[PDB]
Amino acid sequence: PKEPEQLRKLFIGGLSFETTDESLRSHFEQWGTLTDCVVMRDPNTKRSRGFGFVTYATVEEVDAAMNARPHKVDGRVVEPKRAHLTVKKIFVGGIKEDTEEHHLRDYFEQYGKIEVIEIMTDRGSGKKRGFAFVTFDDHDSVDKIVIQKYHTVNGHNCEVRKAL
Ligand SMILES: COc1ccc(NC(=O)CN)cc1
């Protein structure tokens, strides 16, 4: 009944070298229960590697943490990412000739703030080619999208992947 642990983790980059397991935990526990929280360190010197990870009890807690960005942890703005090809644009395929901008917008706007929707048309005829690109203002939207098993838009079962 628990979501897979991999989907509950956040890799936190750009840490202050002074951040510890304890201070990273105290920060990120504001958005959920942490089942794990570790700062990566050198095995010999114990000096921070500048990144670490936190594991929440649920995916909704991961979402809450991501929605609370930017995170300033021990004085430094850090870079959380879900468990990286960091892009803001998706390819959406399988939408056929009847899918319009509003179909894509109404669905994808619940993943993130949309900046561009490009419904692809044939260079020669202008007919729709059956695929589109959606650009968001931030990569987490795409990360949430591509881990779903299924996307249904305008009644079509769509293929969605990271784009460039
Ligand atoms: C920034 O854009 C969005 C960010 C988060 C959500 N929803 C959730 O996080 C729901 N748990 C939707 C849009």
Curated annotation (Swiss-Prot):
<feature type="region of interest" description="Globular A domain">
    <location>
        <begin position="1"/>
        <end position="83"/>
    </location>
</feature>
<feature type="cross-link" description="Glycyl lysine isopeptide (Lys-Gly) (interchain with G-Cter in SUMO)">
    <location>
        <position position="96"/>
    </location>
</feature>
<feature type="modified residue" description="Phosphoserine">
    <location>
        <position position="16"/>
    </location>
</feature>
<feature type="region of interest" description="Globular B domain">
    <location>
        <begin position="84"/>
        <end position="164"/>
    </location>
</feature>
<protein>
    <recommendedName>
        <fullName>Heterogeneous nuclear ribonucleoprotein A1</fullName>
    </recommendedName>
</protein>
<comment type="subunit">
    <text>Identified in the spliceosome C complex. Identified in a IGF2BP1-dependent mRNP granule complex containing untranslated mRNAs. Interacts with SEPT6. Interacts with C9orf72. Interacts with KHDRBS1. Interacts with UBQLN2. Interacts with PPIA/CYPA. Interacts (via the RGG-box) with the HOXB-AS3 peptide; the interaction inhibits binding of HNRNPA1 to the intronic sequences flanking exon 9 of the PKM gene, preventing inclusion of exon 9 and promoting inclusion of exon 10 which suppresses formation of the PKM M2 isoform and promotes production of the M1 isoform.</text>
</comment>
<feature type="cross-link" description="Glycyl lysine isopeptide (Lys-Gly) (interchain with G-Cter in SUMO2)">
    <location>
        <position position="72"/>
    </location>
</feature>
<comment type="subunit">
    <text>(Microbial infection) Interacts with HCV NS5B and with the 5'-UTR and 3'-UTR of HCV RNA.</text>
</comment>
<feature type="cross-link" description="Glycyl lysine isopeptide (Lys-Gly) (interchain with G-Cter in SUMO2)">
    <location>
        <position position="2"/>
    </location>
</feature>
<feature type="cross-link" description="Glycyl lysine isopeptide (Lys-Gly) (interchain with G-Cter in SUMO2)">
    <location>
        <position position="162"/>
    </location>
</feature>
<feature type="domain" description="RRM 1">
    <location>
        <begin position="8"/>
        <end position="83"/>
    </location>
</feature>
<comment type="function">
    <text>Involved in the packaging of pre-mRNA into hnRNP particles, transport of poly(A) mRNA from the nucleus to the cytoplasm and modulation of splice site selection. Plays a role in the splicing of pyruvate kinase PKM by binding repressively to sequences flanking PKM exon 9, inhibiting exon 9 inclusion and resulting in exon 10 inclusion and production of the PKM M2 isoform. Binds to the IRES and thereby inhibits the translation of the apoptosis protease activating factor APAF1. May bind to specific miRNA hairpins.</text>
</comment>
<feature type="domain" description="RRM 2">
    <location>
        <begin position="88"/>
        <end position="164"/>
    </location>
</feature>
<comment type="function">
    <text>(Microbial infection) May play a role in HCV RNA replication.</text>
</comment>
